[PDB]
């Protein structure tokens, strides 16, 4: 049940992809995927490319996958190690969700950072107090790392 579903997800991505984000098994191991996210053009991360590592647990689709960032991003909800626990992947998970919905949710999160879950309190404070400084810092980081 944990392999036919993953094959179906890969086939669906190979037919009608989001055309911006991409996914693929690393070498030949269906339980370890690489993903690429294009920075949204309406957010300070525009022009950047981000890489994600997705681990599919054996209990898939009952248990959500584990996604971790690889490139550092100045975000109030992404820490230095780059871990996102957002409820689609820890609490609000149902078997009907696919891996493309997760990527769409993350690409939406890269535009509306959460203020009330200050995973990085310094960055959250900068965001809540000095919006212009926050956006300038985010663009500086995106130029610095995401290239």
């Amino acid at each position: 049940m944990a392999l036919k579903r993953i094959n179906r997800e890969l086939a669906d991505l190979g037919k009608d992809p989001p055309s911006s984000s991409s996914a693929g098994p690393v070498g030949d191991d269906l339980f370890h995927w690489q993903a690429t996210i294009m920075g949204p053009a309406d957010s300070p991360y525009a022009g950047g490319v981000f890489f994600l590592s997705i681990h599919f647990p054996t209990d898939y689709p009952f248990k959500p996958p584990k996604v971790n960032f690889t490139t550092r991003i100045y975000h109030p909800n992404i820490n230095s190690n780059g871990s996102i626990c957002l409820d689609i992947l820890r609490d609000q998970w149902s078997p009907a969700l696919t891996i493309s919905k997760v990527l769409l949710s993350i690409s939406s999160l890269l535009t509306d950072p959460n203020p009330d879950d200050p995973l990085v309190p310094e960055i959250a404070h900068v965001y809540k107090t000095d919006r212009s400084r926050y956006e300038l810092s985010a663009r500086e980081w995106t130029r610095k790392y995401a290239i």
């Binding site: 909800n77 992404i78 957002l86 409820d87 939406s108």
Partner: protein, 75 residues
């Protein structure tokens, strides 16, 4: 008018509202039709999150507008 909502599982919801109707009224209608509390409802239109205290026309919502229900931010 009529608007369309795509949920997490692919279910499509049709809502009979008006652009002058407030966000609170639309969320109340959605809760009545589905049972999802308005606070837990995160509807994205044109890549932006709608907020209470306003109307649909305040977000440039028109006939047969498409909304996507997404998951709340916890990070």
């Amino acid at each position: 008018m009529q608007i369309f909502v795509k949920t997490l599982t692919g279910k499509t919801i049709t809502l009979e509202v008006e652009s002058s109707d407030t966000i609170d009224n639309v969320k109340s209608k959605i809760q009545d039709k589905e049972g999802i509390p308005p606070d837990q409802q995160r509807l994205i239109f044109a890549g932006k999150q709608l907020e209470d205290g306003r109307t649909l026309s305040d977000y440039n919502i028109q006939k047969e507008s498409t909304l996507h229900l997404v998951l709340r931010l916890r990070g």
